[PDB]
């Protein structure tokens, strides 16, 4: 490996997605990790760990399980928006056939939501309300069916993913690689998507080699994850309609 014109341009592309990413998602993995790990001057989050801590926490539906799912829904809408905003700053993306831009984000946002959640998760739970709150894994599990199980696959994915210790520089280009997946169903101009993805995949490999001396095949194992995330989002999509069929 040599530091040359092509390598320096993969570094500028990495830096440009990193800044663009720090823009679109205010709550970065770095400040998320300072909050989870207590290493912040910032305000300390309020822990929701039982039904009583949730009441004070709130401080319409009657049902606390439904009400939490609703909150989960709204953040998702905001997340889909932030991911689209990010996508506009990926060199090539705004130039693609508008319909193709839509299929990419359509079929990608759920995989990107699983990834961004890991950033907000440790073994105890997930940061909520821009770091102002923390909801414990086991309490979310404590909600009646079918809500009790909704987030558990998120925690499963997030436990093994976070073990890779990816930072914001890696994640920005991880997310850009996902969005430009040339296999999303009904894509009018594939060859052009795959051209942006090839450039993004070189930018990813160089990143991980420079940033992760102890993980020799981390690039290979980020691709396995991008595979993992296909069946995960299926399972999420298919239970997410169960709730549309059984909850008014």
């Amino acid at each position: 490996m040599q530091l040359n014109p092509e390598s320096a341009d993969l570094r500028a592309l990495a830096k440009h997605l990193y800044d663009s990413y720090i823009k679109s998602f205010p709550l970065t993995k770095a400040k998320a990790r300072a909050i989870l790990t207590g290493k912040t001057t910032d305000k300390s989050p309020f822990v929701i760990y039982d039904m009583n801590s949730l009441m004070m926490g709130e401080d319409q539906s009657k049902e606390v399980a439904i009400r939490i799912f609703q909150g989960c829904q709204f953040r998702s809408v905001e997340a889909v928006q932030e991911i689209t905003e990010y996508a506009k700053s990926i060199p090539g993306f705004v130039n693609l056939d508008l319909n193709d831009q839509v299929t990419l984000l359509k079929y990608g946002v759920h995989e990107i939501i699983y990834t961004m959640l890991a950033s907000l998760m440790n073994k105890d739970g997930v940061l909520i309300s821009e770091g102002q709150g923390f909801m414990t894994r086991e309490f979310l599990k404590s909600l009646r069916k079918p809500f009790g199980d909704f987030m558990e696959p998120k925690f499963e994915f997030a436990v093994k993913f976070n073990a890779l210790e990816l930072d914001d520089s890696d994640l920005a280009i991880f997310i850009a690689v996902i969005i430009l997946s040339g296999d999303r169903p009904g894509l009018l101009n594939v060859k052009p998507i795959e051209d942006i993805q090839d450039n993004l995949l070189q930018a990813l490999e160089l990143q991980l080699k420079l940033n992760h001396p102890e993980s020799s095949q981390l690039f290979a194992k980020l691709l396995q994850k991008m595979t993992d995330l296909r069946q995960i989002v299926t399972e999420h999509v298919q239970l997410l309609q169960v709730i549309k069929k059984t909850e008014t």
Binding site: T84, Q101, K106
Partner: peptide, 12 residues
Amino acid sequence: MGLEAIIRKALM
């Protein structure tokens, strides 16, 4: 449908 809506609006 609910998704494409929000994505086209964000692209705007």
